[PDB]
Design a protein around this ligand. Sequence first.
Ligand SMILES: CC(C)(COP(=O)(O)O)[C@@H](O)C(=O)NCCC(=O)NCCS
Lengths: 255, 51, 81, 82, 192
Amino acid sequence: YIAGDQGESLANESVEAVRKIATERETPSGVKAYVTGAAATSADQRAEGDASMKLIEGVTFAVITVMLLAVYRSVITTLIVLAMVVLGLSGARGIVAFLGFYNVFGLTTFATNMVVTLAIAAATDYAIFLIGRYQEARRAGEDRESAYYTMFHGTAHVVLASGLTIAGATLCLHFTRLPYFQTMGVPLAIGMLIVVAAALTAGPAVISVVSRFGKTLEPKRFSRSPGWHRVGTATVRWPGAILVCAVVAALIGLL
Amino acid sequence: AVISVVSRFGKTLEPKRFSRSPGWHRVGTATVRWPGAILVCAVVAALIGLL
Amino acid sequence: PRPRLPWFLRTFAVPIILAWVAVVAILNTVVPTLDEVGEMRAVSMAPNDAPSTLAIKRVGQVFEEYDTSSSVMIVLEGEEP
Amino acid sequence: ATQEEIIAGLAEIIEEVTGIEPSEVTPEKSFVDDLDIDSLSMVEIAVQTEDKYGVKIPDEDLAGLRTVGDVVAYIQKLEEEN
Amino acid sequence: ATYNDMQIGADYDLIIVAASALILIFIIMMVLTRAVVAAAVIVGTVVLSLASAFGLSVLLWQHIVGIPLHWMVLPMSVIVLLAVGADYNLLLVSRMKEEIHAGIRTGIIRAMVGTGAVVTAAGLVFAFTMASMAVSSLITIGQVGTTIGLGLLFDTLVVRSLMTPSIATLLGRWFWWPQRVRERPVPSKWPT
Ligand SMILES: CC(C)(COP(=O)(O)O)[C@@H](O)C(=O)NCCC(=O)NCCS
């Protein structure tokens, strides 16, 4: 029996201490010490997520980068989107760690890993909506000045509502008997709020400034989506047939 | 007393820059027509150090 | 007739960006990284209401051996008996 | 209304659906190869016409119509069918 | 028994989490859209996506890979799928209200073109982001990412593209109830 309970940081230290002496001893030839337990398995579970967290961060970006290149068809535009993502992640990582250092709320490996990925993905989606609407205004022929106002008018409230929805959903995770779920709602809810504030403040500020410096945020494809016009038309005149196909897809998952 | 005495003996205390202030002239314009916008920026700077 | 909020994000765009960079700079310098802080705040997965956790602790209390709920085992696996 | 006015409205609708210039669209032109317009695109034209000018063209009649003048003649017939 | 305690706790929490999440999302969508039915459709469509999403992840791991899904995976994936799914529907629905002025039928077409690959790109990236978690050595973390990632693909390509527009077409004015909206405006005369 060792100090601390399963999942607690003290147990991880206790498992480390017991295993340390077990490793640092003159075991007889053939005989080897093997420290194993439920707490030990949980203790090493925390480390794996924390250790792999660096690799998860690297892969996530690499995927987004490539995706940003294809969608916007512009290297300069891709870097602008990435810049807002880094700031969003940096704010999310800081405040969650900031409050945790003062023992405001607990943190688990599942909580920490989910805080990082969610923040990065959410931030990327918010940026696309702002820029995507902005380039849509540019294709409509609006100048760089009126496009900015139209962009913020038609996306800020939607982004605001979407962020609260994500934050609100994570808030419900707190109302759980289990500790891991209960201790994960608060970190996620706070983390999402930072991104929404950052996306609605740093986002428009960057878009306002960068557009003034040459042809940077202006689109380049200037091409429609032939598929969408066909998809929408079918739903307008024959919604039942389209709905049945949607219903069929849901039933497939039920199998 | 020092200023009065020295000023009469040669072109000593007369200004040499002889240049107006473009930085302060523009800032004063912003702080008048949009006091709320300027004040909000000022308040934000104060709250930064509280962390 | 521009709305105040987007206009404030445009006319004063430059200071707004600087503030966010300044705020982030404080957060990382003052407080250690997320991984370091997160390990300290590792909460126990065993719930308080869980009878099984209480039962193991209760055994230690009555037997006056321990008060925890986590125990490890050291196996001395040898080539020969 | 007048044949020219019906074309002007339809040609504007055709531009939105695909991008064909209103001046390019003439009653002589046909959706087969002259306009290079698929049946699905023609369906959307009827939907926009129904929600803008109130002219309802069922898909059965859409297949029957061949050229712009044919569409206008049927639409102008609907104007007659008060 | 501790695993049973985890099981019993998870069973109660999952029901509570699901009910609480749906109610909050219902109100938030109701407040912004100012339509009772429209919020219900948005919430209702998302739930259908999760049902299909759940089976795919189970097939991916329990059947294809063979490693069963972790018990904690399902409660974690529910909130994220519900949260993101409601957002993409809201983006389309909010755009529809901005386009419903010139006919319900025409407005739907404009909304799809207005928010097409834009939401699709954002939807794809989020799914990839979740899939990028799998790289984690711990399979439990990997399972959570894959389950959420698959759902976003279904929500972006099925519910948003097909299910949501179809329902609004059938309801017509009822889709925006209690707000009064005309099915179509006054028919116009042919311009010169
Ligand atoms: C429009 C139609 C039903 C009939 O077309 P036809 O009369 O030219 O054969 C079919 O060809 C069609 O849909 N063509 C467009 C391709 C597409 O993607 N349609 C999507 C709507 S389901």
